């Protein structure tokens, strides 16, 4: 049973959650190659592990910047959660460590680039293409939510395409283990459920709403709620009036009305029958959930691979030195990292 698979999956998770791995490498073990992306409290770099010659993506977080942005507890969540999970569509954390200045998370390198890049370039995905990605997210959230985790930042910028054309969810910066309700305003404006905007307690249902936004964005090529400033996006979301492209199939529209549902008693994912309302929807009738999980389905798109350590599927970013202070910064705040 999936119930039973997930039961056992939780026992595995809980062991790692209660006794987290810590300090499993050192910066000098890696050669830094190139910046793959950036964010407010740091960057992600392509690196090579000298001892194996394996290439990895190393997220580097400046501890002082994390403190300023009030992301201490969120960063601790991120690392504690990522070291404990195990699912085909979650990027693996290979190593983590810290030094005087920074925290480091060394993860598997996903060479095909961001969904975002391919989506913007190509314009939109066919319904079958979008459905293939959406299925992987459906299974992933089923997994995460069974572990009492809320993910809270679904978007194409953090969905990387692997060499087999399947999705890797990266980034867990807003992921949280919580039974019941939570309150933090976090996420990306276009993907926020109305509950978050309206500053209510929310739960894992915000992830199912975010799935609706993702599917719409993939199939249409633009999100259901856009504007030039975030405040204008929020006004649109809380209306929740959604218009669909004339090219959207009738099933796709019906799935999205039930995901992008302001009414929690009515939002798919949130009902008595849980994820199965989604999995059994007509739009997914052709999806073989076991073959998706097994990675037996032929991907609609396979990214270009010129070689190992190739970054051609990634944009170029300004390179900045990794400076390590001779004085320890913020030791107490990140003691458990």
């Amino acid at each position: 049973s999936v119930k039973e698979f997930l039961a056992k999956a939780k026992e595995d998770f809980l062991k790692k959650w209660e006794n987290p791995a810590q300090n499993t490498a050192h910066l000098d073990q890696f050669e830094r190659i190139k910046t793959l992306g950036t964010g407010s409290f740091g960057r992600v770099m392509l690196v090579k592990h000298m001892e194996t010659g394996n290439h990895y993506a190393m997220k580097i977080l400046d501890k002082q910047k994390v403190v300023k942005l009030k992301q201490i507890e969120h960063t601790l969540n991120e690392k504690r959660i990522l070291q404990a999970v195990n699912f085909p569509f979650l990027v693996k954390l290979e190593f983590s460590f810290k030094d005087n200045s920074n925290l480091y998370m060394v993860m598997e390198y996903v060479p095909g680039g961001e969904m975002f890049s391919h989506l913007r370039r190509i314009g939109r995905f066919s319904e079958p293409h979008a459905r293939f990605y959406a299925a992987q997210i459906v299974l992933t959230f089923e997994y995460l939510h069974s572990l009492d985790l809320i993910y809270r930042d679904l978007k194409p910028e953090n969905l990387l395409i692997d060499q087999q054309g399947y999705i890797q969810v990266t980034d867990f910066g807003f992921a949280k283990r919580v039974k019941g309700r939570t309150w933090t305003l976090c996420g990306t404006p276009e993907y926020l459920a109305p509950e978050i905007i309206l500053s209510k307690g929310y739960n894992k249902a915000v992830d199912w709403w975010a799935l609706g936004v993702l599917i719409y964005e993939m199939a249409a090529g633009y999100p259901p709620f856009f504007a030039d400033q975030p405040i204008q996006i929020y006004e649109k979301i809380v209306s929740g009036k959604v218009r669909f492209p004339s090219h959207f199939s009738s099933d796709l529209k019906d799935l999205l009305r039930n995901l992008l549902q302001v009414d929690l008693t009515k939002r798919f994912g949130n009902l008595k029958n849980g994820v199965n309302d989604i999995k059994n929807h007509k739009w997914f009738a052709t999806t073989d959930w076991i073959a998706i999980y097994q990675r037996k389905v032929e991907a609609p798109f396979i990214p270009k691979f010129k070689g190992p350590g190739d970054t051609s599927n990634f944009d170029d970013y300004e390179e900045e030195e990794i400076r390590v202070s001779i004085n320890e910064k913020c030791g107490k705040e990140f003691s458990e990292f």
Partner: peptide, 20 residues
């Protein structure tokens, strides 16, 4: 067209996370 309006908007690039 909605596509034209999107492409002309300021939010076709990578979108930053927000937090309170």
């Amino acid at each position: 067209t909605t596509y034209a309006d999107f492409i002309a908007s300021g939010r076709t690039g990578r979108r930053n996370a927000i937090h309170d």
